[PDB]
């Protein structure tokens, strides 16, 4: 849902109607194929929250 | 609001229930197809009085 | 969640 903004230093999804910066994951984010493709994609991580809790 | 028009098409097809990577994966193909029906307008006016 | 029980 929403769009990817930038603050220059750092990326973030926000919804669409009202500015409101969420970091970038697994859960608001969705996978499709490899990077090649697609116009105008850029880097960034996006975080992936199970990992520091299968380390517990 | 300006926004760039790739992503407002984006935007488009997630209104008709097709999810938004399927224009991206298929961009230029779909900018052809528009393209060329554009073309098939002007041809159609100017012959069909 | 499968996979990762070899924790
Ligand atoms: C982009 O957003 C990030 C996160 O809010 C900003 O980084 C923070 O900056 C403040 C000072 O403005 C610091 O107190 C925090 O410690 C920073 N946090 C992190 C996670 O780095 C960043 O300054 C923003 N950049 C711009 C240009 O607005
Ligand atoms: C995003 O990261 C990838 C690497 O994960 C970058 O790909 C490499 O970029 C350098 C510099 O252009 C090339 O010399 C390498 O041959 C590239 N490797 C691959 C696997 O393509 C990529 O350029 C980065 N994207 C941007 C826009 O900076
Ligand atoms: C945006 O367009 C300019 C030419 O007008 C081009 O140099 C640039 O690479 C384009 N950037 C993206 C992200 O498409």
Request: glycine share 6%; hydrophobic share 40%; proline share 4%.
């Amino acid at each position: 849902e929403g769009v990817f903004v930038s603050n220059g230093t750092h990326w973030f999804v926000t919804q669409r109607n009202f500015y409101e910066p969420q970091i970038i994951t697994t859960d608001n984010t969705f996978v499709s194929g490899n990077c090649d493709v697609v116009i105008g994609i850029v880097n960034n991580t996006v975080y992936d929250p199970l990992q520091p809790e299968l380390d517990s | 609001l300006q926004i760039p028009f790739a992503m407002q098409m984006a935007y488009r097809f997630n209104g008709i229930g097709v999810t938004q990577n399927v224009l991206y994966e298929n961009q230029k193909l779909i900018a052809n197809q528009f393209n060329s029906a554009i073309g098939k307008i002007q041809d159609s006016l100017s012959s069909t009085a």
